[PDB]
Design a protein around this ligand. Structure first.
Ligand SMILES: N[C@]12C[C@H]3C[C@H](C[C@H](C3)C1)C2
Ligand SMILES: N[C@]12C[C@H]3C[C@H](C[C@H](C3)C1)C2
Length: 64
């Protein structure tokens, strides 16, 4: 499930790169790198948190 959550994070980062401004893109790219590190550490709770964070960042762009 670590890897699958990382996939969902990557999918959202792609959507942010498609519609977000460059500051939001940098925020999402840092989130992705953090998520890769958390996967490597097998820190499932952190990967779950970063997915919620990505969902929120994206929702806010999409709804602005
Ligand atoms: N302006 C930027 C373009 C691209 C995405 C992001 C980080 C780097 C590379 C600089 C913003
Ligand atoms: N692995 C990366 C994919 C993409 C380009 C670069 C910076 C970010 C976004 C993480 C390497």
């Amino acid at each position: 499930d670590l890897e699958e959550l990382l996939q969902k994070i990557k999918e959202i980062v792609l959507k942010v790169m498609d519609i977000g401004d460059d500051e939001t893109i940098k925020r999402a790219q840092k989130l992705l790198i953090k998520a890769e590190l958390a996967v490597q550490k097998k820190d499932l709770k952190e990967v779950e948190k970063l997915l919620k964070e990505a969902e929120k960042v994206y929702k806010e762009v999409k709804e602005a």
